[PDB]
Structures are given as C-alpha cells and as structure tokens.
Amino acid sequence: AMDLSLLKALSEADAIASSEQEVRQILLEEAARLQKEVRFDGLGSVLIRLNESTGPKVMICAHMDEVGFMVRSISREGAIDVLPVGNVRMAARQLQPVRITTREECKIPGLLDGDRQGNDVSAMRVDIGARTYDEVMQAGIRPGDRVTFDTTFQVLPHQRVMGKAFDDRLSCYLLVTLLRELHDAELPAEVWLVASSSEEVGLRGGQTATRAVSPDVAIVLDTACWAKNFDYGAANHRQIGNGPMLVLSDKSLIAPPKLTAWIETVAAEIGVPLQADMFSNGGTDGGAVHLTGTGVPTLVMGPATRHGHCAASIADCRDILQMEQLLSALIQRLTRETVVQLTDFR
Amino acid sequence: AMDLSLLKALSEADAIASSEQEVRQILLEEAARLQKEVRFDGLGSVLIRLNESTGPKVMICAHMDEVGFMVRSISREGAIDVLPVGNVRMAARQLQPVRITTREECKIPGLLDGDRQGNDVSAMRVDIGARTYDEVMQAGIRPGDRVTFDTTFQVLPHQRVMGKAFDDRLSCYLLVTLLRELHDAELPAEVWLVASSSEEVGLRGGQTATRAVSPDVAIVLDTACWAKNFDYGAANHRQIGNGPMLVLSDKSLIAPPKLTAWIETVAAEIGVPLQADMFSNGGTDGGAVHLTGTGVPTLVMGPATRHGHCAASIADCRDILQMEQLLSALIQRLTRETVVQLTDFR
Amino acid sequence: AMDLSLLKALSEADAIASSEQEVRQILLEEAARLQKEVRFDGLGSVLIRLNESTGPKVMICAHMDEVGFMVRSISREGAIDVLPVGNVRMAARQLQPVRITTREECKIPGLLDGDRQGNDVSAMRVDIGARTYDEVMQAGIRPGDRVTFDTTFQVLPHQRVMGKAFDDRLSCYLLVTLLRELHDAELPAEVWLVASSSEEVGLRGGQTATRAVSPDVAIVLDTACWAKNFDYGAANHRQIGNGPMLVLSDKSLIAPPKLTAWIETVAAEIGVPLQADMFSNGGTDGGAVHLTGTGVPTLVMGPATRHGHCAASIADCRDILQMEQLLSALIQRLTRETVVQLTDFR
Ligand SMILES: [Zn+2]
Ligand SMILES: [Zn+2]
Ligand SMILES: [Zn+2]
Ligand SMILES: [Zn+2]
Ligand SMILES: [Zn+2]
Ligand SMILES: [Zn+2]
C-alpha cells in the first residue's frame, strides 16, 4: 500500500539547501508520533534513531532538499532576478510556473523565464505581475527567498505518480515508511534514518550527518532517470517498473563488490528485481559518505524516475514498494557477523 | 638491483577502484613473509607498520588502483558497453586490446573501441567476439567487471622498462623494496607504508588511510609524464634518466618550502639528482592527504615516466633505484627534532 | 579441426611488403615436408604446385604482407619516425604497442604515437625509451626496419580467435591446410597455391605471380569487416559465424556471374552458407589478377572478420573451416569442361 497523501505532502513541500523546514517538520511529526528520539547535525540534518541495539550501526540516508532557485535581486520594474540552486535542467529554465516562499511563509506564484544562449540559459527572472520594486517588497519577497516549481502532485494511469522533487522526496518517503514499519521491531542492527541537509549544492549534510552518526554501513537513497526517455533497450537500467536501481558506480563512489553481491543475493531471495546502473555524469551523497572518518562501506540505491531536476518526474509505485521491501529485508539481515564478513580484506 | 619479477607482477595485476585484490594480495604476501603487522581502512587501503618507534610518524603513500574501464551493460548483440574509471587518455580509447576480469577471476581478452567526436571519445564498447547477450553471460561477464589494458610488462634496451599501470605500480614497487630493505633497521621515525585505495577516481583512499595513520609527515609517491614526449629542453622536468621528480606544486597541493629544501639537501648529500616539477593540469594523493585533521606537512615525489594513462608507460630503472635510495635516506634522517624544525612557523 | 599453433605462428609473424621472410619460411617448411615443388616470382611470391594434371590451371591466391609501419628516421633525441605501410586505420595510430624488427632479426618493443589533426593522424613516432640517436643505433635499429603491432594471438570464448594480421594470415592459413589435405589427392585441375608479395601497397605481387602461373581460373582469398561492428542487420554481409563471404564486387573487380553462380551451387550442395558482399571502399588482389594477360575469370572469397587493419581482428573458427571445406570441394569439381562452360560467351 502507498500512502499517497504522505507522498503528496513531501513532493509538494518546498525545501532547498539551508531552508528545509517544510520537509523537516513532516519528518519530526512522524518521529514524535512514534516516540522516537530525533537528533540534528549543525546543518539541520534530521537523525532518527530507529531502535536500540548492540549490533552494527546502519545509516539509511535521503536528502531533504530539491533543485530550485533563490531570489537574488529585485529590479526597479519589479523583475525578480533568481539564481539556480542545484542543477536545474537547462530545458527547465524557460517559461516555467514557479512559486516564491517568503520569510513569513507566504507563497506567491510566478512565471520564470531566462535568456537562452546555445546550450545555456542564464539571467533568469521571475514575474509575479509587479510593476515596481515596492510592489515586490509589499508581497513580502526578499533576496534569499526560495523558489520552486509550481507543481501539484498527480496520479497517473497504471499506478504511477507524477510530481516535483522526486529527487529526493521519494527517498524521504521511504525513510518514513521504514520508520512506520519497523518502529517496534527487534533488529540485529542499530538503525539511523537520516534526512540530510543541502545535497543538491554539493555533498554537505551527507558529510556532517555521517560524522554525527558514525555508521558501520551506509545505504544512500537517491534516484535517477535515463536521458533517452523511451529507449527501453538493454542500455537503459533506469526503467520505471523494472525494479529498484542498484548503483554500481557514480562520479563520487564505486560501490564495494562484497556489499553489492550481498544485496543482490537478498533481493533474489525475496523476489525483488534489481537494475544495476552506472552514472556517467551524476554524483550522489554516496561519495562524501564513504570517505568519512576511516571509510564507510556504502552504496547507493533507489527507484528509477523519468525526467528529473525539472517541473515533474514520473515514478512507478511498484518500484517504490519493492525498495521499501528490500530495505526492510536488508535491515533484518544486517548482523554483526554479516557486516564483519563484508569488510574483511584478508 | 631491480626485482623485475616483482615489477612485472605489479604492472600486470588488474586492479581498479574498489577491486584491488590482485595488488593487495601481493602486498599482503610481502608483509607476512617479513612478519609485519598489516591494518586496513574502511576502503581496503593497506597500512603496513614498518617498525616500532617513539619518534615521529612518517607515512609513505602510493595508490593501488590503475585507470581502466568497468562493464556497464551488455547488448542483445553481445556488445559490452563500458565506462572509463579514472582519466584514460582520449587517444587510448580506440582499437585497444583489453581484458575483462569476472567475479570468478577469469580473464577474457577483447578489443575496446570508442566513438570519436572531436577531442572526445565516448560510447565505448568491448568486443569479445560474442554474437548474443547470452554468450557474454556464459563467459561469466557481468555489469561491474573491471577492464584493463591487455599489456605484457617488457624490458627495453638500456635498462628501461615498459608496461601498464606504472601510475602507480612503480610506487607500489617502491613500498615493497623499502619494506624489504628496512624491515630490521633501527629508525628515528615510526614508518607506515600505505597502499591506498581508489586514487584515480578522486581524493578517496588517500583521505581515509591518512586519518587511520595520523602521520606527522607524509611522502606521497606518484608519477607523471611530459605531454611533448621527445622535448628534452629546459621546460621538461619529467625526463626519464634525469632523476626522481620533486613536485613543487599540483592542482591539489603546494609543497612546503621547508620540507622541499630539506629533501633537496638530503638528495645533494647522497648524490641523487632531482627534477623540480609543477603540474598545471593534474592532482594527486597529496591534496587530500595534507588537509587531513589539522594539516600534515606533505609532498609528492616519484620517478618520471613517458606516456601515462594508456596501454603502456616507459620508465628508467636508474630513476627507480635513486628514488628507493632517496626514500631510505630520508627515513633514516627523520628525527623528532628534524620534523619539529620543519613545522615551526614562529 | 583448427591448427591453432599454425594460425598463431602466421598471425604473430611480422611481414610487410618486401620483407616477408617470416611468412615465406613457414610456407617453405610446409611444402618441403610434403616434398612439394616451390617456385618464386621476382618479388618473392611463393608458388606451390599442389599436383600434376593435364586439366585446367587453378590459382588459389592469398597475400603474405600485413599493414604496419616502416622506420623512416631517427632524431637526435632517439625518437623513431615511421611511415605507414598499407592503410592502417587512423584510429590505430595513437598510443599503440608495437615492435621493430632489425636486420639482425632482433625485436624491440615500443609505443607508437601520432599527431591527430581532424580525421588524419600523421607524424608517427615510435618510443623505445631511447634518449639519443646513438642508443637507437646501438639497439640495431635502422631506416627501413619493419614495425608491426605487438599483438599476441588469443583464443576467445565460443571458438573464435583474435590476433593481428588476420588480413591476410587467415588466408595463408587456408593455403597451408589445403596443401596438407590435398597433397596426395587425384584432382581434375592443376592447382597452384600462391602466397603473393606486397598486396597492402597496391596491385603488386598479385600481378607478377599471376603472370608466372598463367591460371585458367583464380580464387583470391581475402577478408573484410563491416564498419558498424555490432549491426547484425540485413545490410551487414560480413558477420562472423554467418559463413564465408563471396565478394560480388569491389573497387578493383566485378566477379563473373557465371563463376559466382557455380560456386553458389557447390556451397549449397555441401551445406556451406555464403554471405554475398560488395565493397564500396576497398580493393583486392582480385583486380590486378583478372586483368593479367588476356583476362582470367577470378573471384574473391574469404572468412569475415571484425575490425581490420589494426592491432587485432576477430574471426570465427567455423567460418574458417567452412571456407576450407568449400575450397576443397571447388577444386575437386573444377574439370576442363566446367571451366570451358564458365568462360563461354557465345
Ligand atoms: Zn538531484
Ligand atoms: Zn538526489
Ligand atoms: Zn593517474
Ligand atoms: Zn597516480
Ligand atoms: Zn588489407
Ligand atoms: Zn587483404
């Protein structure tokens, strides 16, 4: 079963690096309802201790922030200059409905447009219909205000879903349903569920949250899409409906073969199909995470999406439920001896 | 003397980020034979304690991984899509003999080819003569398999050598011969010989291994070649036969003048000529290493090579022997008072 | 069965136009062991009379030479300038392992590199690690020395093989196995097996050897590959595993319909599938051969390969065995009345 109102709430929440209160508050409400202790790092990353165990520490990590824009400047004509926060697709920077969230938490709708030069779109502005600097000031808008795509979460035919911020609200969704499923479970590992701050602008909350937790093993949840959307050939290992992705490599991390092989054997036991994927361009917080302290065995997993870093992505509900199932099964098998065996280089 | 069978074993070993077992086992055999304690970081970096001393901690660091490719995908026709691991030269991605190592450690030879567009070569595929997907599966080949240049180590005239992975197997070679020479020596410093994991893909095993060791001083061993191979002019400071290189700067590190001055005085005492070099394009272990904790006085040194990040590099045996001699002499002189003198900013 | 040691010997032999002694000696050893008469043309082409017959003269022709390079010049720095011999692929002229054979028959390994400008790669140099002119002289290297790809012959999965010079060492291989099989056979034709000199540089040994033999009919054995390697569509008629190629046309020859029809009927009788192919870009022995004297009915056949004129090609052993079988069957059926029928224009 999908909780579509939770997925709607997370998708529609407006949260960028350093202003993630809308996502944080959802997570905090879930933890408080289940009487779970919440800790924070210096950046505001949410650290939820699932349980108490003398077994190995496992961190399951998602990012709270989405790609968007930030108010930079207001012109005398009431044009709102913005800069991108994260890698917003160049093709998603022209004539796009957006909304601006002010310090008083008011939301003002607008149309974003930019100048195109070849590949690149820069000099972006948001139009709220204002004719003066003062009209914008009156709406409560200020430099630093977050700007996000103006997308309503929607259900698609055949149990697929569409909305903004699936990178990485799908994984925030998974953190919550893991918490709901496993809050009273007897587990062989101590599990920390981490929603890290500010991933889209680099590798920020990932680093600090990992240090605060100090896991023995880490699972980073992120998503990705194939550039050629309707190419269902053997080269596309990011096809929605074909099961969770197991990321073998990205620019920041090459997954450890022992951990990869173990997860594959668990997925095969429980009947979850896996897509083994490699990122040619992208980075995840997998990179910063594994390089913490003296090194953490880490891999990246997640459901595939179509499109990404734009007004809307598409995901398949079965993929999401299967990731939930695989994560739970992995957690239930992560014994001290298992994690020792997966880190023995002799 | 040169141990050519050792250099052959190291050069011909196939080891990329996260799959360095072929090099690690060679290192482990050397340490065991000399009854030396071996530790690991979380990434599998090999940490060899040479001795016990109350003097300063000295780390000598080389990397285990080589540039290569990784199996990404297998088409219905039996084409094996691969992605580069590390910066493989663009001119080394077309019609190159390679071999793939499977999870069962079988080695399947193949021909790599890529699609050239201008400077760039991408969409790389390996051909093993297969006609179907299932033929490749039957050979044991899977996504994630390491792919390396199919190069046999060879002796050249006038005591020079040619083979793959000289970056950084020449430096792994140096770690071993230092271990063989100094295993029973009385030394003013506690020496750690570190073969770090995953350097070609970033600041990876270097960072974590340095933290595990916490040295007072670090020498990072790496190699480089001059782009204009037969220009023996004054601007080429990477000429084979002209002595070990002392790297004054690279993208990731500017060596401390106090440390470089000291090394220069030791080399002049023992009659080892040095080439002072600056990297305009490249980075090293050096960058990650010196930024560890509150900062480690660090420099980069090593034998020059011709060519690099391709099927074969060329090195001069005299250069290698002189580096070995300079490393031993530095270690014998690294007293507590020396390393305090070289770190005094007052 | 395949004689892999023979194919290895032929593939690994280093032989270019005017220096084909390594292949010629292999051929001479086979003929002597079977007490067969060997003649030469003025270029050194090897002419083997299989038998004595009053029937029509049949020539079966392969070429001895491979594409490679030739030492042109040695600089004061010990760089060895080379020029290509034959059409070496442009994508096979950069960072390629090679070896140089001197007049004393020593083999010095090296790395070839070239200067790319657009499509073209020129100003090729070989590096043997030398630092001076005199170092190269001391190694025995001189202008005129042959330079070949440094490729070891290798077995691939599913009974396929990989090595250099498959163009045209696969066909030299076929000459030898035909000689071994048919040395004592009673035949309706007088068969001449010809390994011609210097094909890669023009219409060279083909022309002169044909004149020395004056055949009534000629089969020229050569190989080709399809530019788009993994396109197994209907337009690729050079797929390994799909049977020997019958060349309907190339730049230098349009095969006689009467001859191609006959061969097609023989192949269908014995169950050998054929791929009918047309060269849009290439020429062969076929062109020079058919224009000899008052004209010789001639066609080109051979096993397909993948890749060509580079460090390594791939071939399918079944294709090679089927060509051997088709050649033997053609020879056994080539009666005086057959070859008169196939040349009657009235
Ligand atoms: Zn993202
Ligand atoms: Zn993400
Ligand atoms: Zn390198
Ligand atoms: Zn290196
Ligand atoms: Zn040819
Ligand atoms: Zn040919």
Domain boundary among C126, C149, C172: C149
Which chain B residues touch A343 with a CB distance below 8 Å?
42
Q: Are residues A23 and A81 in the same domain?
A: no
Domain boundary among A91, A116, A149: A149
By DSSP bridging, strand C154-156 and strand C38-40 are: unpaired
Closest Cβ opposite residue B162 in set C109, C151, C307: C109
Work out the minimum CA distance from C128 to partner chain B, whole angstroms.
7
Distance between CA atoms of A282 and A17, rounded to whole angstroms?
A: 18
User: Where does residue C92 fall: left (phi above 0), alpha (psi -120 to 50 degrees), or beta otherwise?
Assistant: alpha
If DSSP codes are grouped into helix, strand and coil, which group holds residue A130? coil
Q: What is the largest CA-CA distance in chain A?
A: 70
Distance between CA atoms of C343 and C339, rounded to whole angstroms?
A: 6
Q: Does B152 touch chain C (CB under 8 A)?
A: yes
CATH number, residue C288: 3.40.630.10
If DSSP codes are grouped into helix, strand and coil, which group holds residue A218? strand
The answer to whether C83 and C145 have CB atoms below 8 angstroms apart is: no
Q: Which stretches of chain C are DSSP H helices?
A: 4-12, 21-33, 133-138, 166-182, 204-213, 257-270, 285-290, 317-332, 336-341
Q: Are residues C37 and C53 in the same domain?
A: yes
CATH number, residue A116: 2.40.30.40
Scored b (16 or more CB within 10 A) or e, B194-220 reads bbbbbbbbbbbbbbbbbbbbebbbbbb
Please list, in sequence order, all residues whose beta carbon lies within 8 angstroms of the beta carbon of residue C202, skipping any fewer than 6 positions away. none
Work out the minimum CA distance from C275 to partner chain B, whole angstroms.
16
3+ Cβ–Cβ pairs closer than 8 Å linking B and A: yes
């992995």: which residue's tokens? Answer: A330
Tell me the residue type at A63.
H
Domain boundary among B129, B149, B169: B149
Residue A331 CB burial class (10 angstroms; 0-12, 13-18, ≥19): buried
B167 marked as binding residue? yes
Which chain C residues touch B316 with a CB distance below 8 Å?
129
**Interface contact flag, C97 B151, Cβ < 8 Å:** yes
Strand partners, C191: C58
Distance between CA atoms of B9 and B23, rounded to whole angstroms?
A: 9
Ligand 5 centre to CA of C229 (Å) is 17
The answer to whether B241 and B156 have CB atoms below 8 angstroms apart is: no
Q: Are residues B58 and B85 in the same domain?
A: no
Which residues of A are catalytic, by number? 199
Q: Are residues B100 and B198 in the same domain?
A: no
Q: Does C124 touch chain B (CB under 8 A)?
A: no
Name the token pair of A182. 């496993």
Closest Cβ opposite residue B128 in set C127, C139, C156: C156
Tell me the residue type at C278.
M
Q: Are residues C159 and C300 in the same domain?
A: yes
Ligand 6 centre to CA of A130 (Å) is 75
Which residues of C are catalytic, by number? 199
Query: Among residues C306, C271, C10, which one has the least CA distance to residue C160?
Result: C306
The range of the structural domain enclosing residue B83 comes to 68-149
Which of A254, A259, A296, A299 to probe the B interface (max B CBs under 10 A)? A254
Please list, in sequence order, all residues whose beta carbon lies within 8 angstroms of the beta carbon of residue C275, skipping any fewer than 6 positions away. C237, C238, C239, C242, C243, C244, C245, C246, C304
């200067």: which residue's tokens? Answer: C115
By DSSP bridging, strand C245-249 and strand C275-278 are: parallel
Measured on CA atoms in the order B320, B323, B329, B330, is the torsion positive or negative?
A: negative
Work out the minimum CA distance from B218 to partner chain C, whole angstroms.
31
Q: Are residues C105 and C198 in the same domain?
A: no
3+ Cβ–Cβ pairs closer than 8 Å linking C and A: no
Please list, in sequence order, all residues whose beta carbon lies within 8 angstroms of the beta carbon of residue C281, skipping any fewer than 6 positions away. C251
Q: Are residues A246 and A172 in the same domain?
A: yes
Work out the minimum CA distance from B265 to partner chain C, whole angstroms.
28
Strand partners, A83: A70
CA distances in angstroms from A145 to A86, A98, B185, listed in the order given: 15, 12, 64
Which of C111, C128, C137, C152 to probe the B interface (max B CBs under 10 A)? C111
CA B281 to chain centre: 17
SS3 track for chain B: CCCHHHHHHHHHCCCECCECHHHHHHHHHHHHHCCCCEEECCCCCEEEECCCCCCCEEEEEEECCCCEEEEEEECCCCCEEEEEECCCCHHHCCCEEEEEECCCCCEEEEEEEEEEECCEEEEEEEECCCCCHHHHHHCCCCCCCEEEECCCCEEECCCEEEECCHHHHHHHHHHHHHHHHHCCCCCCCEEEEEEECCCCCCCHHHHHHHHHHCCCEEEEECCCCCCCCCCCCCCCCCCCCCCCEEEEECCCCECCHHHHHHHHHHHHHHCCCCEEEECCCCCCHHHHHHCCCCCCCEEEEECCCECCCCCCEEEEHHHHHHHHHHHHHHHHCCCHHHHHHCCCCC
Q: Would you call the peptide bond into C145 cis, given omega within 30 degrees of 0 as the criterion?
A: no
Distance between CA atoms of C10 and C26, rounded to whole angstroms?
A: 8
Q: Are residues A187 and A265 in the same domain?
A: yes
Resolution in angstrom units: 2.2
Q: Are residues A191 and A322 in the same domain?
A: yes
If DSSP codes are grouped into helix, strand and coil, which group holds residue A219? strand
Distance between CA atoms of C178 and C169, rounded to whole angstroms?
A: 14
Q: Residue B171 CA: which ligand is closest? A: 4
The answer to whether C239 and C230 have CB atoms below 8 angstroms apart is: no
If DSSP codes are grouped into helix, strand and coil, which group holds residue C70? strand
Measured on CA atoms in the order A89, A92, A93, A99, is the torsion positive or negative?
A: negative
If DSSP codes are grouped into helix, strand and coil, which group holds residue C121? strand
| Complete DSSP assignment for A300-330 | EEE---BS-SSS-EEEEHHHHHHHHHHHHHH
Distance between CA atoms of B52 and B187, rounded to whole angstroms?
A: 9
CA angle B38, B44, B45 (to 5 degrees): 65
- For ion ligand 6, residues whose CB falls within 5 Å: C 167-168, 222
Q: Are residues C100 and C157 in the same domain?
A: no
CA distances in angstroms from C101 to B4, B75, C114, C312, listed in the order given: 24, 40, 20, 19
Query: Among residues B266, B332, B277, B280, which one has the least CA distance to residue B301?
Result: B277
Q: Are residues C139 and C244 in the same domain?
A: no
Q: Are residues B312 and B218 in the same domain?
A: yes
Closest Cβ opposite residue A280 in set B43, B83, B202: B83
Total number of domains constituting chain B: 2
The answer to whether B218 and B210 have CB atoms below 8 angstroms apart is: yes
Residue A219 CB burial class (10 angstroms; 0-12, 13-18, ≥19): buried
CA distances in angstroms from B165 to A71, B152, B153, listed in the order given: 49, 11, 10
Ligand 5 centre to CA of C309 (Å) is 6
Name the token pair of B249. 């700067």
CA distances in angstroms from A339 to A189, A296, A334, A335, C152, listed in the order given: 10, 11, 7, 6, 43
Ligand 4 centre to CA of B100 (Å) is 22
Which chain B residues touch C89 with a CB distance below 8 Å?
95
